[PDB]
Amino acid sequence: RTPFEGFSVVLPEDADLDSAPLVRLSKSIREEGLEVRSLLILKDGKLVMERYAGGVTRNHNHSVYSVTKTVTSTLLGILNFEGVLKNVDEPVMDSLRSLGNLPFPLLEGKESLRLRDVLHMASGMRWSEFPEREDIRTAEDPLVIALLPEVKDKPGTKFDYSNGDSQLAAAVLENKSGSTLLQFAEKTLFSWLDFKDYEWYTSPSGRQTAGFGLRLRPVDMLKLGILYLNNGNYKGKKILKPDWIRQAIKPGASQNYGYQLWTHQFEGKKTFMANGKGSQFVYVIPHRRMVIVVTSAIWDKPINFLLDKILENVKEALDSKDKKKIPEKETRFLEEIHEASL
């Protein structure tokens, strides 16, 4: 029960959760052979489950893949809080021209793209049809790769899940901040939330990749969720404007995609999440004051499989009549968590 970087560590029952469905969840993960490295559940500010796999400890980091997109959006949010980024309708082109060193053929046809359009994965650049889309992972300059395609659909109208759009969003951040993604994060988000043992893929150009490449501790993923849960406040420090969060969670071109994050529902009520391939999640449930964090290596199932499983059992934990603290229940809980660790 020793507090962990601000967080009280408690039994599910201490936060009005039945531990039994959480034990069943953890057992089901094991016996279905699901490679879940971390599963953290926070409720009412208390860390009620902290499940690590064999070899994984509190201080290990994990590739978070598309969770990186949400971090990118958060950093733009911070620029908005600081007043530097006034308006999501400003053309991305203003930032591209200001950065410079970008040949005109990369810029041609992109004069209408708004920051909103790239945040929404709605640039109109058909990333899904761009044969060299994987080059953003290895090229000298990811921004150059992001600018190779032409704008074909009216910006803001067509959803196409794109690392290129994330990178164009990051260009706005670079121009307005004077810093790369990681540089700005270390001045702001990562400093303010006391992140530890993070790493972010840095291309030869010095630019980070906006859509992927960040590695984080699960506890740091949890803090990112807390920041949104508390409407842009972390431990009494204002970091995001409420208006920014409101816009960020509003569906754009896709009925379920805001500013580099997904909307969802739990108990019929609006929720939202960062997520990444292989089943990485930062899942925020405002009406229950909960954040759920997951890192995994599940490559043979869609990410909704693990998400739905977790949410089913969390619902059972909330609805259960059996919420009394009983030594037998503590032991089965602690023993299952131990087993998962082996």
UniProtKB/TrEMBL annotation:
Q: Does the keyword Nucleus apply?
A: no
- Identify the residues that the record assigns to the Beta-lactamase-related domain, covering every copy: 38-297
Keyword annotations:
Lipoprotein
Does the UniProt entry include the keyword Membrane? no
Q: Can you name this protein? A: Putative lipoprotein
